[PDB]
Structure formats: structure tokens, C-alpha cells
């Protein structure tokens, strides 16, 4: 590259601000890819001692989607250590109280359990809705693609495809429906 040594080092080890969207995405897949980016495992110069994490800015965290009945099954447990500090809240209740807590907890769980985890969480940025602070928006690079594909409700189908899909059966003329 014929760069000078110091600018070359700076370019190689610079931090990148990635953008990620919630909005009908699974918190787990969001957390997996965000954790990869935060650890810096996506870089080929990666090493645990090289401090090569990147900033991850996740938005619409209020609009995540859980598969199955996870909203009512999944229980988050904590303990304020005073006798009886054991609290357990379903995913619905936790989401209602804090709109970013679920994604934050998922990323925290997926991060490696060492002393760099809190630094990585410090580089992670979460926002419940469309609004993003201007400095962060001016820092952003590379909105990453969403893991899920948003299956496109029936009323969102166009007439061309509606009529291109064949009709499967012939109803009787005398059925009330």
C-alpha cells in the first residue's frame, strides 16, 4: 500500500461503526452477529489481546420478534441479594419495562465471559426506535443486512403475484362462506 508505518497501523486497527436494525428480527440472531462484530471476530487480524472490537448500533429494538411462545415462556431471573431478592419476569414484562433490555441481555450472554465483556458492551449502542443521535448517525458505516426476511403480510401482496398464484380448488356455488 506504500503507506507510512503509523498511518498504516492506524488504518489496520481502526474501529468501524456498524448499523443494525431490529424491526421483526430475532433477538438471538441480532445478538449473534452484533457479538461477532463487537469481539472483532470478523477481522482477519483478530486476536484477544489486540483490542480490535467495533461499534455496533442497533435500532428498532422495541420491535423485535420472538419465535414460538417465547414472549410468555422465556423468564429472566435476577436476585437483589436481600432475603427475597429473587425476581423472575417474563420476556413480555421485561420488554414492556425496558425496550432494549432483551437485546442487551442476549448480546451480554453471547459475549465471552472475561474482563473484555464490559468494554465490548460499552462499545455497543442500543436504541428502541427509529431515532438515532446525530453524532452516532454521522459516525455510522455499513448498515448490515437483517437476518430474517419479514414474510410480507397478505395485504402487502401485489395483484400481479396474487393472480399469478393459482387458485387451488373449486368451491361449490351454494356454500355460504
Amino acid at each position: 500500500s506504500s503507506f507510512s508505518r503509523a498511518p498504516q497501523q492506524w488504518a489496520t486497527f481502526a474501529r468501524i461503526w456498524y448499523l443494525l436494525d431490529g424491526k421483526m428480527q430475532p433477538p438471538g440472531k441480532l445478538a449473534a452477529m452484533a457479538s461477532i462484530r463487537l469481539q472483532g471476530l470478523h477481522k482477519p487480524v483478530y486476536h484477544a489481546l489486540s483490542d480490535c472490537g467495533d461499534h455496533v448500533v442497533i435500532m428498532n429494538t422495541r420491535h423485535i420478534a420472538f419465535s414460538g411462545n417465547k414472549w410468555e415462556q422465556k423468564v429472566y431471573s435476577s436476585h437483589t441479594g436481600y432475603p427475597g431478592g429473587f425476581r423472575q419476569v417474563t420476556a413480555a414484562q421485561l420488554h414492556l419495562r425496558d425496550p432494549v433490555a432483551i437485546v442487551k441481555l442476549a448480546i451480554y450472554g453471547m459475549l465471552p465471559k472475561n474482563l473484555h465483556r464490559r468494554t465490548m458492551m460499552e462499545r455497543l449502542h442500543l436504541f428502541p426506535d427509529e431515532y438515532i443521535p446525530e453524532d452516532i448517525l454521522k459516525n455510522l458505516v455499513e448498515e448490515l443486512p437483517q437476518p430474517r426476511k419479514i414474510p410480507k403480510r397478505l395485504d402487502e401482496y401485489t395483484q400481479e403475484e396474487i393472480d399469478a398464484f393459482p387458485r387451488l380448488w373449486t368451491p361449490p356455488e351454494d356454500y355460504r362462506l
Binding site: 414474510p151 403475484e161 399469478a164 398464484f165 393459482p166
Partner: protein
Amino acid sequence: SYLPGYVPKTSLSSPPWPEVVLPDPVEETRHHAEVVKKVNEMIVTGQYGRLFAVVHFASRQWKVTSEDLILIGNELDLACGERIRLEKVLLVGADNFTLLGKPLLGKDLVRVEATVIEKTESWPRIIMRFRKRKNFKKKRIVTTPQTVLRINSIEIAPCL
């Protein structure tokens, strides 16, 4: 008229991955010929600089360049400062082109020239074995022989 086997377009009527069609063999072969000729004329003209190679040596694979140093973990039956030819070149490349062996490139195509410049010993290595409550304790000190080779030159020839 629907063909006997037509599936209406559903989410999983077709594989999720995109359909890929490979180039036809004849046109593709002529394309390979043109590409190889272009790289060959690049080599003939000399439109390259600072070659690098991946070379098999002493059971190891080394990515070397000219003016390089490597440390081989054994003696090599060579006097100091002796020029030898490294031959088992898995890969040679430069900017804008690289040549891949299957698995080795022809010796008419590339030469690696190196020079034995040092014959030394490693720093002492400690082998200590210990098993507790059984009085088990052994200590050994070893010094593996070593050879420092300087990669002098990587040369390619027009032979594609």
C-alpha cells in the same frame, strides 16, 4: 399450460439459494487461454515487482519473499553462506497475478534461491515431568539444532 411438475411459487417451493449457471466449456476454455496469454505477456514484459512465494520446506509451509529470513528447526548438512535452490513452491504471486500449483509448480516456472547463513542452537528448553504424592519428578534440558536461511531471490519464467 403448466408443465407436469410445476410448483406454485411458495416460500419453500424452490431452494433458497440463487440459481447459478456455469460458463460453457468451449468458450470458457478459450477465455482461459486468453487470460493465461495475458499473464504470460505480463511476465515476459516484466510488469511485476516484489514476488512472494509459499514454499514447502522441512515439513513446513513458509510464505517468503526476497531478502527474507527463516529459521529451520534442524541441521541441514550445509556449510555457512551456501546458496541452495528451494524447489517445492506451492504458490508464487505478485501484484495483479498469482500462480497456483497442483500441488507444486513446475521447476521450469519458478526458482527460489536461498542462502544458509547461520547454523546455531536453540535456547535451552526445559522438559519437567511431575506427579504428586508418588515422588515423581524428572528434569531434562535440550537444545535443538537450527539453521538460519536467507531468501535471496524469487524468479519466474515465461512458461504458461
